């Protein structure tokens, strides 16, 4: 008979996108540094240090960055992760206590107070007068000399992180699942929504590191071909601009105070690291940029969001008008110590369609409280000596503004939200598959029985 | 890298090549949709190594077991559903049922010579569970026709 | 409804019709020996979904794990078994095994015709070890024959 | 006891034996590969049993679980080799590979009479991935071959 008969094939090369639980893979180096000088490799399995990309020809497919499965997992991972670092370390609860205070003397500065306070020995019934330094910033005047307690003592206790554990970011691979692939958008000119034209499977992703910053992002992954900025949809305000440069702007970050720890045992084999005392002068935490090449990389953005904008719309940068101190400042981790700094300093200027330093000026906190979940506060211990770090500035958010008199729609200002965009800024061209190995096609060939 | 052919010795490099010349790769999806579990096995690891206490992250492995159990499980279906087609033994079968060209009206050469794999997905995707129903009850009476005449002689 | 013939498009429905009728469900208790996992696959989840904190409620989840690959093993068990006889591809087989009638002194209508299922597994039950031992040995000894019978080419 | 033919009966008990004599065991070592996890599901049990506190020990339970699903994931990976060979169903097979003896220079008498099957894995273990390679490709065109002589009816 000349008509076709259904033929069943297995292994047949298609797919279908799902939801599913990636599992996270660390280069083993890190591994082999065993026992936990960081969080993350002491269960993110080592590495096959063969990746193996394999180009998929022919094929073009719709990625869509936004509503992407994996950013949602390394949200959670992460958060995960953290609390887990600091489940084992020592809860600081007998140091919610009233302290006597006074403003420090060796140093323009009235940030950092000195405080005297009483706390148990290890023996039950002993307890000894002890004084430490803290900042305006982690102090509350309860109330003659004035009279404080920490700034978390009336909502939660905190846990100190201990000092062995760094808070450092590895390099965190993604890998997929068994009957599940990984697809990676190749094209140079992506913007985080549409049919890519040419894709690589890959068994596991880049080495992502989680960092974790505010207003703009940093030591992270930037584009070869322009300067990228990319939106669920730009036109609606609510939404942030995604901006990743096309080369790195360098920053520089120092805290000048010659830092001492002291070490106060708490109770039986427990102990708390106070700030003992600074030597030499008091001086200001900061950070620089040279304005030559961060005028430049404005310039080149500037010529992206003109694309969007009209032609000789008058694009202007303003600073994080208002709120609290986490919305208004720049803020990360460098080398153990948190900093929050006011970019003022960089997003203030006007463009029109026709060397030196730049330095901003910081303040640090010892209590912390990621993700701002209302019980979590931990406390981080003071660092020896002064200390610096040096970073790539990878690309920055931006948030946009309604018709701010007449003329320009895009009064621009350094943004944020929830960190989850910063997982997004790296996981923007990856997209995750569940194959389908049967298949069912007509041809000419029958079975006999 | 691009193109028909070439890349076949990896991983689903075939998918943007016609249905005719994608139909000799067949085993290296086969064996990959298992075998993948080397990245598991290899390097699952527990309490001791690379971590002591923080005890919920020797728990977090759940994840991975977790996978692995699926994986096992959503191959073993596949040779149970391919099974009572009266098929497991093999990665091709020809079958006893016609194909009703209500399902697609596309002639012999350009189903095998035009489209890929990915494209004739989506036409019979509205009719599979037809067929599946078909091959089932085409299996189901020839094990009875069989064990008749094994019987008769 | 209760009858012969009929509830036999539902899991066990046909179990007191007797074992003639019967024998044409056989693919759907068997299909749905394994493929029930959905009920489990569709919803086994950590925290952080209904749930938000209260993880052992969560690691609690280790009972519906077990349940799975119990299931699994099971299945792959009677595939081997089954496999082990000379009987992989199939839901019905014909072995060279004799019917010793001390088993059951029964004609070969009323097996069929009269008797459930469940009234035959009551009587084979007593002998069912010797009749396992008799089909491996009977295969095992027709591998080695028919690797002879191509040997002599 | 240490001889030939003796201890077949027993798990690993051929294993001193030369590999003729040794091929009648295959069945044992096979059932025992993944029915063995009786040991494991007979006694593996969370609530309740002699132990309702301390509940730490039962998640220190994932030890034993996670060597379950390793058993089950093992054995499937060999059938799933076996099969893409087109010898799924059997202890044996036949198979269009001519054996080069550069891959070993001993006679079919010696080979079948003399050495231990541990003994010949010493040897065979250098070209055994060049083996399964012509293997697969043998089936991987035999498949197409028979899918044309079913064509051209
Ligand atoms: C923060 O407050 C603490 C407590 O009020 C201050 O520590 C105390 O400072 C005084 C001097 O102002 C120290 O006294 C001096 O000690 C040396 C020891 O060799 C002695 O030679 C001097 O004659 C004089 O007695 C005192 O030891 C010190 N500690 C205590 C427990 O009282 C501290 O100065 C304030 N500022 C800073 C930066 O810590
Ligand atoms: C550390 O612990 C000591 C001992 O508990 C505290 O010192 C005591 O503090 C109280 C409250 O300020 C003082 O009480 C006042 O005493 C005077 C004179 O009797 C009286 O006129 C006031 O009305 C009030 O009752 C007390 O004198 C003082 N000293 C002693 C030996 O008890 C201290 O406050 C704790 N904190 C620090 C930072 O040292
Ligand atoms: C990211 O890049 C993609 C292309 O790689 C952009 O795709 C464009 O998406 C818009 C809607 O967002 C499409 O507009 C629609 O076009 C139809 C034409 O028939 C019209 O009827 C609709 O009213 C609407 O205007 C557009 O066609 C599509 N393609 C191109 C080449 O623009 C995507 O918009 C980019 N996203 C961002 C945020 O830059
Ligand atoms: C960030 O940018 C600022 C401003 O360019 C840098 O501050 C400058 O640093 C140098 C070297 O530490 C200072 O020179 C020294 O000044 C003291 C006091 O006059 C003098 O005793 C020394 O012999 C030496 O000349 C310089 O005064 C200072 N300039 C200003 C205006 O503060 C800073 O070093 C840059 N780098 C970092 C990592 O922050
Ligand atoms: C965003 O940028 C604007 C303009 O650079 C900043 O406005 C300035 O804010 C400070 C307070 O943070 C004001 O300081 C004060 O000065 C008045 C006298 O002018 C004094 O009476 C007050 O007691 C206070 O010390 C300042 O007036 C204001 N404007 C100017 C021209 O400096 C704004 O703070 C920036 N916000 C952030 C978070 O970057
Ligand atoms: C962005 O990446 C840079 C480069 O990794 C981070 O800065 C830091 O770079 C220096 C030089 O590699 C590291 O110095 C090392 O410090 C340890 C003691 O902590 C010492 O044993 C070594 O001999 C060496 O001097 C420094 O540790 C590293 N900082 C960190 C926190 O890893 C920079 O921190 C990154 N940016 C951000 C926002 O973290
Ligand atoms: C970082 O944030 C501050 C706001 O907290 C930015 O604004 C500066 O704030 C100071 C007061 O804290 C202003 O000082 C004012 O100077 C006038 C001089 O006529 C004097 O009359 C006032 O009494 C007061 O002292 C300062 O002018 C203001 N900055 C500007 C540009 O106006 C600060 O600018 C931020 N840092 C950077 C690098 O932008
Ligand atoms: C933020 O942008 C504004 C312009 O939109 C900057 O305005 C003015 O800039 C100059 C130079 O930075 C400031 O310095 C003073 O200028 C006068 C000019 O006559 C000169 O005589 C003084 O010796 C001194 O150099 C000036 O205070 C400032 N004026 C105002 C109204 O802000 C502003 O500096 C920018 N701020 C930052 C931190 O970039
Ligand atoms: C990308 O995929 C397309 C198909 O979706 C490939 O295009 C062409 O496909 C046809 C079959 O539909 C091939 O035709 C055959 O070619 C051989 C050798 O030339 C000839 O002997 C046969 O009679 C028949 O004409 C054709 O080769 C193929 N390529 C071209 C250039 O037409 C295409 O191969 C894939 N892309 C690449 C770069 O390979
Ligand atoms: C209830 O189950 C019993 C067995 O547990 C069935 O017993 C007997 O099975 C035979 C089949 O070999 C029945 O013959 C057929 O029955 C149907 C319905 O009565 C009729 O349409 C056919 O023409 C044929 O007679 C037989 O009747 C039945 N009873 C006896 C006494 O032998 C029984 O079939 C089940 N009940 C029903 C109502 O089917
Ligand atoms: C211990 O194992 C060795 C090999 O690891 C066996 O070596 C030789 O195997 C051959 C079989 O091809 C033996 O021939 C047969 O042996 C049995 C038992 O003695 C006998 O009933 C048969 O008539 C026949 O001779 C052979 O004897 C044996 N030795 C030599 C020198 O070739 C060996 O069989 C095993 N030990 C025993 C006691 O079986
Ligand atoms: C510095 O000390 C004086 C006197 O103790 C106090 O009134 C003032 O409030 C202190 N300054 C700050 C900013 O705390
Ligand atoms: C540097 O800044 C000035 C003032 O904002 C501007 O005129 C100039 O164009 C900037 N440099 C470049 C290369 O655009
Ligand atoms: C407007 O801007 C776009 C993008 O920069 C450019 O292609 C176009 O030539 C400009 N047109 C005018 C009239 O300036």
């Not at chain 2, 689903?12 to 080397?38: D, E, K, P, Y």
């Not at chain 2, 919920?56 to 279906?77: N, S």
Request: net charge positive; hydrophobic share 35%.
């Amino acid at each position: 008979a000349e008509n076709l008969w259904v033929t069943v094939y297995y292994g047949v090369p298609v797919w279908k996108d799902a939801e599913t639980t990636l599992f996270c893979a660390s280069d083993a180096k890190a591994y082999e540094t065993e026992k936990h000088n960081v969080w993350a490799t002491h269960a993110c399995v080592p590495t096959d240090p063969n990746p193996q990309e394999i180009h998929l020809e022919n094929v073009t497919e719709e990625f869509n960055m936004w509503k992407n499965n994996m950013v949602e997992q390394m949200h959670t991972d992460i958060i995960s992760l953290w609390d887990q670092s600091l489940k084992p370390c020592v809860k600081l609860t007998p140091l919610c206590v009233t302290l006597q205070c006074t403003n420090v003397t060796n140093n323009m500065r009235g940030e950092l107070k000195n405080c005297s306070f009483n706390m148990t020995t290890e023996l039950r019934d002993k307890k000894q007068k002890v004084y430490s330094l803290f900042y305006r910033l982690d102090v509350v005047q309860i109330n003659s000399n004035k009279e404080y307690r920490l700034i978390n003592c009336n909502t939660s206790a905190c846990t100190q992180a201990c000092p062995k554990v760094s808070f450092e970011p590895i390099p965190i691979h993604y890998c997929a699942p068994a009957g599940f692939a990984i697809l990676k958008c190749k094209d140079k000119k992506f913007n985080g929504t549409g049919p890519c034209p040419s894709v690589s499977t890959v068994q596991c992703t880049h080495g992502i590191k989680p960092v974790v910053s505010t207003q703009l992002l940093l030591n992270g992954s930037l584009a070869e071909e322009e300067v990228m900025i990319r939106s669920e949809n730009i036109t609606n305000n609510a939404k942030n601009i995604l901006v990743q440069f096309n080369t790195p702007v360098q920053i520089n970050c120092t805290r000048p105070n010659n830092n001492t720890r002291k070490s106060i045992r708490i109770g039986p084999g427990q102990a708390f690291y106070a700030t003992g005392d600074i030597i030499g002068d008091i001086r200001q935490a900061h950070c620089n940029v040279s304005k030559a090449t961060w005028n430049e990389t404005l310039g080149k953005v500037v010529k992206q969001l003109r694309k969007h904008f009209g032609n000789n719309t008058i694009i202007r940068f303003a600073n994080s008008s208002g709120g609290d101190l986490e919305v208004t400042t720049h803020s990360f981790n460098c080398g153990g110590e948190f900093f929050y700094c006011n970019t003022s300093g960089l997003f203030n200027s006007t463009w029109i369609s026709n060397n030196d330093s730049i330095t901003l000026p910081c303040r640090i906190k010892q209590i912390i409280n990621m993700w701002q979940r209302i019980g979590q506060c931990m406390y981080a211990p003071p660092i020896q000596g002064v200390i610096r770090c040096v970073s790539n500035i990878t690309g920055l958010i931006l948030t946009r503004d309604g018709g701010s008199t007449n003329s320009t729609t895009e009064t621009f200002r350094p943004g944020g939200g929830d960190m989850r965009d910063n997982w997004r800024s790296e996981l923007y061209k990856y997209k995750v598959v569940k194959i389908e190995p049967l298949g069912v096609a007509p041809t000419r060939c029958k079975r006999r029985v | 890298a691009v193109g028909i052919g070439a890349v076949f010795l990896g991983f689903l490099g075939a998918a943007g090549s016609t249905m005719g010349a994608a139909s000799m790769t067949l085993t290296v999806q086969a064996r990959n949709l298992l075998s993948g579990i080397v990245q598991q096995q290899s390097n699952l690891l527990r309490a001791i190594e690379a971590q002591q206490h923080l005890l919920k992250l020797t728990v977090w492995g759940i994840k991975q077991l977790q996978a692995r159990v699926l994986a096992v499980e959503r191959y073993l279906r596949d040779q149970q559903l391919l099974g009572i087609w009266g098929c497991s033994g093999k990665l091709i079968c020809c079958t006893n049922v016609p194909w009703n060209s209500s399902w697609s009206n596309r002639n012999l050469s350009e189903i095998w010579d035009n489209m890929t794999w990915l494209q004739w997905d989506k036409e019979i995707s509205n009719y599979t569970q037809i067929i599946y129903g078909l091959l089932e009850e085409s299996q189901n009476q020839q094990e009875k026709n069989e064990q008749d005449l094994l019987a008769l002689d």
